[PDB]
Amino acid sequence: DLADRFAELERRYDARLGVYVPATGTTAAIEYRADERFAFCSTFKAPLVAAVLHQNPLTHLDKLITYTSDDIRSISPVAQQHVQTGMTIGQLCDAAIRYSDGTAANLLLADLGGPGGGTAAFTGYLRSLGDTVSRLDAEEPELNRDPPGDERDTTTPHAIALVLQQLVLGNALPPDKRALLTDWMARNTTGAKRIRAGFPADWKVIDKTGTGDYGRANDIAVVWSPTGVPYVVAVMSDRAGGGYDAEPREALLAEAATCVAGVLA
């Protein structure tokens, strides 16, 4: 059945695969290695934006943040362009989600504040959503680099799916902040070959990707059927057998998502 198909994918890509889809009214949870830890990688940037939105009035989005050359320490497609003028919190949220901008994420962590450059407050935000599993310990670029099996900077497919469910479908955020988060994920530019690739075109998909060392490739999404029925989909993977420089393999996530879509159709 579905477990056999996911195991086939692990052998095909020399990978470890984790999948979680929470249960709904009529569908049982889909779970494969769903309680094993995988690195967040950039998937943490979605709940990070939620944390910053929740913490501040909505007009905080218009506050200008300045930064300089020594702040660009990671893949930062937007922040590298605006370094000469600064970026507002809103622009930083946009870039962190839609371009997985690492400098934007680091600046948003600092905006959250507190110990660990904001990582402790980020973890505390997850705890307030009932997530007792996930932990963020470093910022960019280091959070992509922990050795396989190390629990620093990890979540699980199960844990991050339940967090995303509350943020997008539940009441963790007031409606106006919920809509900002949802719209940024809906306009993501980095996810076309992951969960989006597994679902038919008449399904709506919003997502946040993650990519890291040891062949790490993640995607977390909310999808809506053509009749508006929502599902949360978390897919996580690594290829530790190839070492630090193992290539991430997006097609693994597209195939896993195709399997999931077949069950939810």
Numbering used by the authors: 29 to 293
Please give sentences taken from the publication describing this entry.
BlaC is a class A β-lactamase and due to its broad substrate specificity towards β-lactams, β-lactam antibiotics alone are not an efficacious treatment course for TB infections. BlaC, a hydrolase (EC 3.5.2.6), cleaves lactam carbon–nitrogen amide bonds rapidly, effectively deactivating β-lactam antibiotics. As previously reported for BlaC and other class A serine β-lactamases such as TEM-1, SHV-1, and the CTXMs, the global fold consists of two domains, the α-domain and the α/β-domain. Located in the α-domain, adjacent to the α/β-domain, are the catalytic residues Ser-70, Lys-73 and Glu-166 (numbered according to Ambler notation).
Herein, we provide crystal structure evidence to demonstrate that the serine β-lactamase BlaC can be phosphorylated at its nucleophilic serine by the novel β-lactamase inhibitors based on a bis(benzoyl) phosphate scaffold. In the case of the phosphoserine crystal, Ser-70 showed clear density for a phosphoserine having been phosphorylated by the inhibitor bis(benzoyl) phosphate. The phosphoserine structure resolved to 1.52 Å. The phosphoserine crystal was in the P212121 space group. Additionally, the phosphoserine BlaC structure contained phosphate molecules near the active site adjacent to the nucleophilic Ser-70. In the phosphoserine structure, the distance between the oxygen atom of the phosphorylated Ser-70 and the phosphorus atom of the closest phosphate molecule was 4.5 Å (phosphate pictured above Ser-70 in Figure 3B). In addition, even though the previously published BlaC structures contain phosphate molecules near the active site, they do not have a phosphorylated Ser-70. Consistent with the proposed phosphorylation mechanism, we did not observe an intact inhibitor, nor released benzoates in the active site after the phosphorylation step occurred. A plausible reason why the bis(benzoyl) phosphate scaffold worked over other organophosphate scaffolds might involve the electrophilic nature of the phosphorus center and the pKa of the leaving groups’ conjugate acids (e.g., benzoic acids vs. alcohols and thiols). This new crystal-structure evidence suggests the inactivation mechanism of BlaC involves the unsubstituted bis(benzoyl) phosphate via nucleophilic Ser-70 phosphorylation, and is expected to aid in the design of future novel β-lactamase inactivators utilizing a phosphorylating scaffold.
